[PDB]
Amino acid sequence: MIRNKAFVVRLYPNAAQTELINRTLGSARFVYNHFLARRIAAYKESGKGLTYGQTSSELTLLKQAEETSWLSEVDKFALQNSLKNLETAYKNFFRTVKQSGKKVGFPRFRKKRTGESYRTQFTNNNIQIGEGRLKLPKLGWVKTKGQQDIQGKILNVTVRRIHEGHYEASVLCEVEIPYLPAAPKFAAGVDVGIKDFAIVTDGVRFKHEQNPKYYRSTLKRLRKAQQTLSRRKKGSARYGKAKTKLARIHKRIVNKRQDFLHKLTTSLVREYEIIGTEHLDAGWGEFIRQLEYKAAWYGRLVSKVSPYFPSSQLCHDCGFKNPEVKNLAVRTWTCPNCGETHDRDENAALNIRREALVAAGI
DNA sequence: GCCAAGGGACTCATCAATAGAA
RNA sequence: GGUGGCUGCGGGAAUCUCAGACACCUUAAACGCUCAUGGAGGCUAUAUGGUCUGCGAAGUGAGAAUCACGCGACGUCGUGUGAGGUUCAAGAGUCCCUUGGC
DNA sequence: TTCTATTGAT
Ligand SMILES: [Zn+2]
């Protein structure tokens, strides 16, 4: 019943806290690079990889050294977790060395990039959560907007810089999540359509989860923005402004899609005991990920149809397969075996529901 | 050699000691 | 007078308040804006068609777009601090890889 | 000066 859960809140640090955040990110990156180089040199020297303990000790001697004493300014937890990041990169590489086929590459030097994070643990109430405030080590109280009810025991806080002037902190808390009570409906079947994002059916009726309002309208504004950027010559300030506006429109599209999927998946979890989706505008990967983790948290069970199931071809009533349904132009078709005409999307959702129950076994 | 966006695999600290301060 | 929406802030989405503007006349559709410069093109639908434009299109440079309070400068501007309604929803981190663009 | 916040070693 106790789950690792993350609460993302937007940070609004003042000038000094922003300076300290940037210093901490730089220090973490420098430590990662330096001790990657040190491990490589050690393997070249003695043929034995340095343990995390040996890398930790040299960091402590690095901190006291005059040439690298500046690391004392930033939080210790950030540097040590950067060292743990290096160790995990090495661990991934070592695990994949034996395996054939897909192989994790050797760790590479960390480079300056817009999205960087530093992670600080919790100990002796150094992290405290108030109403509209958040306390982080070495920083003090920082004002947070959109702070939900944060419960459980705080484990660590990940301070992330999405882009310049945009900071988000992901507070990891070990919160107990109570199971949702019995759902009004038993099971659902979910599809993919062109005009409609999905066709959710409980068996009594079909509910068309159409695309969110203004989604097609926003896609129009996406096309307009690209035209202006394309004709604009590169390197101009107005070209930069057009690129920023295009980036903002992309961000709005992503946010609207995520909100639509979050509300839809929460509704599916609350409304149906068992949810069944075929595994494959779509954004299907995030939909499946959210459905699976929310079902695990709230006690629902997700049954994913085997991709070998050709639901669209089969008729729900009789199971006859028709090659005509393979053609997309055939939105409405009649099954000669069952002598019935049914909508393609409606027939697909009912079949996906039927297979979802079979896989769960009920 | 340089940036952005997706995807798959694995995972999500604790405590004794100690310096300092309102 | 009534109706709709483009752009900006209000954690995300819708609504709404306000603001930059504006369209039309009971139908809701379309479009962010200002200044300077620029010198015939710009947008949409199905190679074809429609609309804007030369008392100025694309492109380039600059700027403003909620509220309260303090400070400085010349009623005005610059700066910092603080605040922003109602309803629904919010699981992230690390590593490598892939793709796209330079 | 006892409570608060940070550090090094696992
Ligand atoms: Zn049939």
Numbering used by the authors: 1 to 280, 297 to 378
What do the authors of the reporting publication say about this deposited model?
TnpB associates with a single, long RNA (ωRNA) and cleaves double-stranded DNA targets complementary to the ωRNA guide.
The cryo-EM structure revealed that a single TnpB molecule assembles with a single ωRNA molecule to form a ribonucleoprotein effector complex, consistent with the previous molecular mass analysis. The ωRNA (−116G to 16C) consists of the 16-nt guide segment and 116-nt RNA scaffold, comprising four stems (stems 1–4) and a pseudoknot (PK). The PK coaxially stacks with stem 1 to form a continuous helix. The conserved PK region of the ωRNA is sandwiched between and extensively recognized by the WED and RuvC domains. The TTGAT TAM duplex is recognized by the WED and REC domains.
